[PDB]
Design a binder for this molecule. Structure first.
Ligand SMILES: OC[C@H]1O[C@H](O[C@H]2[C@H](O)[C@@H](O)[C@@H](O)O[C@@H]2CO)[C@H](O)[C@@H](O)[C@@H]1O
Ligand SMILES: OC[C@H]1O[C@H](O[C@H]2[C@H](O)[C@@H](O)[C@@H](O)O[C@@H]2CO)[C@H](O)[C@@H](O)[C@@H]1O
Ligand SMILES: OC[C@H]1O[C@H](O[C@H]2[C@H](O)[C@@H](O)[C@@H](O)O[C@@H]2CO)[C@H](O)[C@@H](O)[C@@H]1O
Ligand SMILES: [Cl-]
Lengths: 459, 459, 459
């Protein structure tokens, strides 16, 4: 592991293009670079890193990096002044935590409205016109809009539009106790979304893959997604545009803006190699181009290459949406916020909770990293109890099966004894009879249990 | 469910009288009203309401409504100025939360001392005289005092008398971090109560039903209860009075005063029908009278009807005790407070904990809604582990039973083989013998486990 | 239990000498005194005391007593002015909590460097010289240093040296939210220690017993321990000295100073007997001498006897280290702090976590008594799940064993039926055949579960 590099990046990004940068590094230096894209990497990273494992370099939007740093998992990076000047200062702000740089910023990501120019020459300026737009499109076997409803990143622009917010920003400092997921703006936003589902303009089950396939197959007029998605739309040959997100109550949708960033694992014995790879290889016009040609990065942090990329109307639209949204905080509590909003949106979308109760609970859960932890614990314990009860049940049925064969064996022993002219088995061998007797009251008592979450609230 | 009303109210209130109001509503409008009184309604409500179920209207004392509102579960009510003027302003204060009305107030409830005039013509002015009073009554086969020891509502007046308090009220705002369940006043109060149990003037097991039956049967000279209880005493024909609660250390007992209130479920598609039922039907002299004749409501919020009720010496006594106690907060943390005091009082009463350790723990638990949650979780997990271990144990014994029949079957197979002049089973069929071999070290290791609560504290 | 005394004291202290004081008490008064030294007494005490059990008198360093008092478990002690003057005021400060005395102080304990004068005539002034010292000692079949790595008390002096601290002390008041276990000083301290283990100058598994035996057997040049340990070194006949702890980065090591103290259980019906035992018997030159001759107490609180003890160069060294360290807080949060640092040090020492991730987690856990509680809960639940799964697994294998005998019984039934000229069992008795059929998918699904802690973090 010393003398080589392992890099993790998300499965929706240009990892094959990044591997080409790794191949050039290897060509020039002899150093092997391996790029992986595990699932749930943003959750896997802190677990493996804490034990001194995990990759040398970790790529994610900047919002998770404050927590990683607070947890002891990141090396402070040491770019000199000349390198720092190569990148936009606002990108350096995104990766600064308690005064220290904790990652290299790569690219600015914001969500936009992506629309099919052949189905919809002139896309809606407002969210409110969508149901009527969907009505007409449905008559022709299409739909107006499909996007990932399973990740709150995609719904947040709408929730934020009328006033919803994560943590209040005042005096240059986020207040972790002031959360705006349950104010009037947020409620209106999510109610409008759940209204779309109620009136069957969207489906609660739609996830990344489903929306992408529908848009890329010409089935839906619009989707909501980031620069990474453009590559596959090009391949699909759909005639698409990338524009400003619809307004809600006359207010701009407010995407949470992410800076794709690369951190160095505090436990890496390859911190200098990682620095040189990121600074001398990836963060160059040629390194970034290789990644971008694979899956587009968005508006890159590197001024020299961004000056070219900026002339792309897709990148102009990206930055227009960015300017309307807000840069994500990188505070450790961002993971509690996302977990809470994720739970709210899914619960509300699927009709398992009301909008207002979903959001009230999110408000509580976002307002403490320990709050979600308790929520997560009870959720996981509830699952474990069901797995335990299931195993206990199956063993019971297994035992009943075995008993059935034992009973047949006993009947066969008796029949034969009698047929050969003895008494039945037990008086013949002169033993008190052993009878099958199975108690099941315990098993029945387990099958009665309401789920753990309910029983904890009802105590 | 649209076009009809479902109402929940507690099993100790006039629900048959409320159903008569529902019947009149149905007569005038065609709208069916169904009144239910499930057990634990105050705990069932928030669970079903959060999923968009539960009743249209929920009745409880006002203290729980802040939490329900904070959780997204209540509609703001919209009574006009003319209706608002019909009710006392202090009752409207009880149902106001973060500036909004969240329920209709119905009636003011306070606990009083109810005494048997034939056993006790002149009831005690002080708690301290009770043991000597009980001494003499016991000589004649009676007791001085019996009341519900399972619900802290009933013991709180005593605990509060010498200085105990829930949340500190200053600057018109409750301090959730300043809790007075473990100060000197509170300790003295609960010690005096546990002293009554120690010296056998009361029993820790006495609950609502036991006290009510004893008083109503003429077995005990005194009880502590609310206006709802009077109805059944009338039926019993006991000659009773309703008076000021005894003093403790020369201080008035301080009942936590409740306003029976009716909220509208945020998820009800019948919010206007509910408004009209509460405003045009229940909150009238005739609506309230129908409920009151069933079980007395106390001092009603409706000025017109209260002006009659006030002439009742029982209602005068009720309000004298109310004025000496304090209006309950309606803050979300009230449920943590009640849970904590409930646990303390029962633990101390039953001698499972010392007064001082019981109250110290209550202090901690009341000082955070998340604190009780952890306490409740561990309590529930401890129960679940025991249920799991019990099932695991019974399956083990089931398996031993099955094995016993299998062993007898094997002995019978061998005997017969030999009797028919073969060798035993296994050399005859030419197989290595399979032997019953049951491992039980796991089962024994489970039977060794101290309860979860102890093991978590001892980690 | 009324009319006798039960005393708990730790197994490393002079409990046989304390029992001699108990015997003198019994001789003079008739009152039986029983001294016990259960394991984990500091954790057992609060559990048994809360139920009104446990000893009359509890001995521990003063740091745990604030929590015991806050939990309702200690009697305020009532020494008069004349008795108070017998002991140093700073010892009385150690046992004062929210303005009240909650224990009798006995003796001041600080860790020192204990060295073998024959292996090491001139012990190191610095931690940094130890690896080179160990290098040379190892060549002669010895080692430089061995001390208990399982209890953070012993490692803290080093962690504190360069700036690590527990709770920030300002304005005479500890800030429970300002914890210094994860600052630069603390990280450097623990990194140096783990570096010693990496480079094999110490072993992560070394505990109290192992270090004591190695030093007392002449195998290692140095150990770190308190006055109690001297007694067994005397017995060993090793030629030892007791000196100032090594410096780290030119800074003194900073032992957390403990005052061995004796509290009276709030639930004791023997509070006056306990007072008289502690004041009239133990806290005398003769009482303390009896304990000290068993295992040395350190610098005693009793001025009269300390004036003699102070002339001991071992006691001078003890107090030099004390003055360089700091008196422990007695705040309730000390137990969360010790639990957190214990976990960090072991995790880092054993290489299960990195120094930086270990300490970051400790920082979080020390910063709330409820934080550790959640950590402890998940740790205990993880263990319980494994015990449950193990039992579920063994029952499965038990059932497979039983099934194997049942299958052999069936084969023997068939063979015999056929041999006696019938058909096989089932067509002969004219029954559909029952077959053994065991489902195991549940069991396999349980064997797949990652540990609970990981799954809760990954939710
Ligand atoms: O859905 C919550 C999720 O949102 C963001 O993740 C984005 C990411 O920033 C983009 O690069 C892209 O991969 O889509 C992701 C959503 O699936 C946050 O960065 C992440 O922390 C958060 O969990
Ligand atoms: O015991 C705690 C309990 O007290 C109060 O409940 C009262 C209620 O207000 C009365 O209407 C009557 O029904 O007796 C109840 C006690 O059993 C609080 O209102 C309730 O929130 C709390 O849990
Ligand atoms: O290791 C943490 C532990 O440290 C202290 O315990 C000391 C004790 O003070 C000494 O008398 C001696 O017995 O060694 C102990 C360490 O094993 C704290 O007093 C204790 O609260 C803490 O858990
Ligand atoms: Cl069998």
């Amino acid at each position: 592991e010393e003398g080589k590099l392992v890099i993790w990046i998300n499965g929706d990004k240009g990892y094959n293009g990044l591997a080409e940068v790794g191949k050039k590094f290897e060509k020039d230096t002899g150093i092997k670079v391996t790029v992986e894209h595990p699932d749930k990497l943003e959750e896997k990273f802190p677990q493996v890193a804490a034990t001194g494992d995990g990759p040398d370099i970790i790529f994610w939007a900047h919002d998770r990096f404050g927590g990683y740093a607070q947890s002891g998992l990141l090396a402070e990076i040491t770019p000199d002044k000349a390198f720092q000047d190569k990148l936009y200062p606002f990108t350096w702000d995104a990766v600064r935590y308690n005064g220290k740089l904790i990652a290299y910023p790569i690219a600015v990501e914001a969500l936009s409205l992506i629309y099919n120019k052949d189905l919809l020459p002139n896309p809606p300026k407002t969210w409110e016109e969508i149901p009527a737009l969907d009505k007409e499109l449905k008559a022709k076997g299409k739909s107006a809009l499909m996007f990932n409803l399973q990740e709150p990143y995609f719904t947040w622009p709408l929730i934020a539009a009328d006033g919803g917010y994560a943590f209040k920003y005042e005096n240059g400092k986020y207040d972790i106790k002031d959360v705006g997921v349950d104010n009037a703006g947020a409620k209106a936003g999510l109610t409008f979304l759940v209204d779309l589902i109620k009136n069957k303009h969207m489906n609660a089950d739609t996830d990344y893959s489903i929306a992408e396939a529908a848009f890329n197959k010409g089935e839906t007029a619009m989707t909501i997604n980031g620069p990474w998605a453009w590559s596959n739309i090009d391949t699909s040959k759909v005639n698409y545009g990338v524009t400003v997100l619809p307004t809600f109550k006359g207010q701009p949708s407010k995407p949470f803006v992410g800076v794709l960033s690369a951190g160095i694992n505090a436990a890496s014995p390859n911190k200098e190699l990682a620095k040189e790879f990121l600074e001398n290889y990836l963060l160059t016009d040629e390194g970034l181009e290789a990644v971008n040609k694979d899956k587009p990065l968005g508006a890159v942090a590197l001024k020299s290459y961004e000056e070219e990329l900026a002339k792309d109307p897709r990148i102009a639209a990206t930055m227009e949406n960015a300017q309307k949204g807000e840069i994500m905080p990188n505070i450790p509590q961002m993971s509690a916020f996302w977990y809470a909003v994720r739970t709210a949106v899914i619960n509300a979308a699927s009709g398992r909770q009301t909008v207002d109760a979903a959001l009230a609970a999110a408000q509580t859960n976002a307002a403490a990293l320990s709050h979600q932890r308790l929520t997560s614990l009870i959720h996981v314990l509830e699952q474990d109890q069901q797995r335990l009860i299931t195993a206990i049940n199956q063993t019971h049925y297994n035992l009943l099966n075995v008993a059935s064969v034992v009973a047949q064996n006993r009947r066969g022993l008796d029949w034969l004894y009698i047929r050969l002219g003895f008494q039945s088995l037990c008086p013949t061998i002169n033993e008190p009879c052993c009878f099958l007797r199975i108690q099941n009251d315990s098993i029945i008592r387990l099958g009665d249990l309401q789920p753990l979450s309910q029983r904890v609230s009802t105590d």
